[PDB]
């Protein structure tokens with residue numbers, strides 16, 4: 157995956173988020189620190205927060221990441237698209253996990269009612285674990301794919317089943 | 329625990345894998361042809377067992393005392409879904425699912441290679457995205473989970489231009 161996409165993946169709350177542009181940051185709702193009143197030095201007042209279930213978009217009134225170009229955010233992807241989930245692990249290891257995407261789905265995963273785009277890992281058979289699968293610290297990692305000369309972001313990591321085979325991408 | 333990934337080590341023109349503190353496996357063609365030592369041990373001290381494109385090194389002292397010993401087998405049952413544990417010099421980790429087939433002598437680009445055939449499960453193509461193998465990946469291990477037990481069953485020897493078909497060299 158290109159260096160510019162890994163540069164947009166920022167450690168945030170109990171997981172990650174992703175810079176779409178110099179002013180737009182996307183993440184999974186449950187990783188946001190609940191008492192928090194300031195983000196990258198800016199008060200709530202100065203930020204437009206757009207929340208659709210486990211998807212949250214932050215639009216800043218100033219350029220927080222002026223090193224970046226704006227890229228395309230889409231509302232999920234066609235069923236059958238192979239995406240990479242851009243996961244950072246212990247000590248600059250970079251894990252772009254291959255996922256085949258499926259339908260929009262509503263599930264119950266552990267306690268929780270989860271809604272988003274389902275997909276199946278293409279890493280291995282019984283992927284329940286940090287070596288071939290996702291862990292709770294991965295929530296907010298972006299789902300990306302290459303589409304002609306362009307890369308697209310189409311969601312953020314929200315959940316995985318007890319077997320680890322099935323993942324859920326929160327979508328705008 | 330040490331992760332599986334800490335066992336995958338840069339070696340020669342590719343990679344290899346620590347099965348135990350004293351046992352290292354790799355692809356024969358990536359081993360240097362001019363050497364007096366490996367991993368700081370004199371070649372005097374190293375047992376080398378070659379069988380076509382599969383090589384095993386047995387050291388006389390513990391090079392990786394942090395590891396436990398893993399199950400090494402001579403390939404796996406047809407239909408097993410393995411993971412090829414690819415490391416790249418970017419710092420990326422690429423576990424790719426492979427459906428394993430028959431032992432054969434296969435024509436792969438110019439070349440006759442003997443080992444276990446497999447097909448990558450990332451489909452359409454790996455062209456643009458982190459979804460296939462490249463020449464520098466030779467020696468990456470093939471692994472799978474069986475009950476609570478991780479099994480290593482061979483090393484990455486070859487792949488087609490296409491990228492669909494791979495060869496896993498196995499112990500003889």
Ligand SMILES: CC(=O)NCCc1c[nH]c2ccc(F)cc12
Pocket residue numbers: 162163164165166167196220221
């Ligand atoms: C992977 C990654 O985040 N890299 C950049 C780190 C960084 C430096 N200065 C910043 C200001 C805002 C922000 F969100 C990130 C940064």
Ligand SMILES: CC(=O)NCCc1c[nH]c2ccc(F)cc12
Pocket residue numbers: 407408409427
């Ligand atoms: C233990 C075991 O047998 N696993 C399933 C084998 C398998 C993987 N990918 C497939 C795609 C089509 C198909 F017909 C079979 C497979």
